[PDB]
Amino acid sequence: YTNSFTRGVYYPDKVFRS
Amino acid sequence: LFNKVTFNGLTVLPPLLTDEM
Amino acid sequence: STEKSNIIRGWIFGTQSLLIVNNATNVVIKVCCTFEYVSQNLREFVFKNIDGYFKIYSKHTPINLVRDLPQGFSALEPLVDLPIGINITRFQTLLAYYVGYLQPRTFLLKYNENGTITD
Amino acid sequence: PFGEVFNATRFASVYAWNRKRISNCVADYSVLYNSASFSTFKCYGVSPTKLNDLCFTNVYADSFVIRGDEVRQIAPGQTGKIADYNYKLPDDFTGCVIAWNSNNLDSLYRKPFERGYQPYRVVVLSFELLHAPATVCGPKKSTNLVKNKCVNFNFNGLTGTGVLTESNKKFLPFQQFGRDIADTTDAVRDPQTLEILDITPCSFGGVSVITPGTNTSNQVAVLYQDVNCTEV
Amino acid sequence: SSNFGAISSVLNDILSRLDPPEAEVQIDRLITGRLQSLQTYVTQQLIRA
Ligand SMILES: *[C@@H]1O[C@H](CO)[C@@H](O)[C@H](O)[C@H]1NC(C)=O
Ligand SMILES: *[C@@H]1O[C@H](CO)[C@@H](O)[C@H](O)[C@H]1NC(C)=O
Ligand SMILES: *[C@@H]1O[C@H](CO)[C@@H](O)[C@H](O)[C@H]1NC(C)=O
Ligand SMILES: *[C@@H]1O[C@H](CO)[C@@H](O)[C@H](O)[C@H]1NC(C)=O
């Protein structure tokens, strides 16, 4: 078993926020 | 002292007495 | 999958079967035919089906150590969305690979000036 | 090719309703609305006139044959045996249900979107309102882009009035719209040139009148708040 | 950005979709909610001031 840690975030939606 | 302190229809109106005054 | 050789080139999806094959050059995707999809270190892939749309997210990151997932933050850019509308309860991989199930969560996302999700 | 769906020689069963997806084509809903053949043209979340100008990401057509009485059951948030199992409409599906008399030609039945006695063919249209490049667009004519001036802009079915300026935003390719804290869209990508344009609201300011007492004089001075003299 | 019960929180959308008779209903919901939001804001400022 390998810990997920912080890996795996993806952009939720097309709209751009800065 | 001054260093330490930090659209739609909303608008901010300038104070009558400027900081210099 | 943390492989430089990238032997893995297949992804089988089934309860209609969704076959995604990297093959050569453009990736070719078969949902057979109810529909046909036009041809399009560590590799990170997120697979989810929402409303009959299959959104894939892919990021490639060089790894100092193959054994352990790199400590740090990675943002996965969406690659392709397919309106296949096929129910998938099982999946298989065609030639280490780590599989993690996705659970709904509330996330606070930090966006930089560039707009990347820094954290 | 709406004609194919509407004039389809063979119609699907009510319970076994079929869904055909219409995409990548300009769609004119006026023709359908004009045709009197359709006994009912009720639109639940949209108005027929607006249909011509609105641009939808995807259009889904459901074809089934039901008795005249059964037509009412289809309606969203209505309890009918046909609606109970055969075909279910989710509330606020933002689509138009179109039914036409088909008894002459006709003369098997048994979760939302999950699959007197004369039978009438019924086709249900569902409109996708998600924010994505919209494959289906109504008949419209594009006009040349204008920048650095207040302009009323309709982009891919999005209407707003604001100044348009070139945007230095590093828009990601998948991204189509940039939004501020408010729902209003700060930045838009051109449907024809794929350029990122910033939107700035047209200058608005309070008008104040400086008046000496009316008795003393009637002359007045006018102040425009936070408005440059050049603008006005 | 709150719907307050309306189909959408973007006024232009409602105007660009529903016909005048129906739109009124949706708009009224938004007006009521937005109006209430201002009063709350104003009241707090008075007390705070
Ligand atoms: C954005 O990316 C550029 C490189 O294109 C980099 O120089 C800059 O520091 C980045 N800014 C942020 C806020 O990430
Ligand atoms: C079906 O055929 C009729 C023939 O009179 C035609 O008028 C109509 O346009 C066709 N249906 C559609 C949706 O175009
Ligand atoms: C049509 O759109 C493409 C980009 O999608 C653009 O390159 C082309 O110039 C457009 N044609 C016209 C006539 O505007
Ligand atoms: C108004 O615009 C002029 C440029 O023509 C500029 O010099 C001036 O500072 C502006 N006034 C402001 C920003 O109050």
Describe the structure using short key phrases.
part of a larger assembly; 5 chains; little secondary structure; elongated
Strands, helices and their partners?
The structure is cut from a larger assembly and holds five copies of chain A.
Chain A: E1 9-10
Bound molecules: 2-acetamido-2-deoxy-beta-D-glucopyranose (4 copies).
Question: Your description of this structure?
Answer:
- The structure is cut from a larger assembly and holds 5 copies of chain A.
- With 18 residues, the first copy, chain A, is mostly loops.
- Chain A is built from no helices and 1 strand.
- Chains in contact: A-C, A-D, B-D, C-D, D-E.
- At the A-C interface, β1 of A face β7 of C.
- Bound molecules: 2-acetamido-2-deoxy-beta-D-glucopyranose (4 copies).
- One 2-acetamido-2-deoxy-beta-D-glucopyranose binds next to loops of chain D.
- Chain C: This is Spike protein S1.
Number of helices of chain A: 0
Number of strands of chain A: 1
**Helix-strand pattern of chain A:** E
Q: Which chains make the largest contact?
A: A-C, 14 and 25 residues
Q: Which radius of gyration of chain A do the C-alpha atoms yield? A: 12 Å
Largest sheet of chain A: none
Distance between the termini of chain A: 36 Å
Characterize the overall form of chain A.
elongated
Helix content of chain A: under 10%
Secondary-structure-based class of chain A equals: little secondary structure
How much of the sequence of chain A is in beta strands? 5-15%
Instruction: Name the bound molecules.
Output: 2-acetamido-2-deoxy-beta-D-glucopyranose
Please, what is the oligomeric state? part of a larger assembly
PDB class: viral protein/immune system
Keywords: immune system, covid
Entry title: Structure of SARS-CoV-2 spike in complex with antibody Fab COVIC-154
Chains A, B, C, D, E: Spike glycoprotein
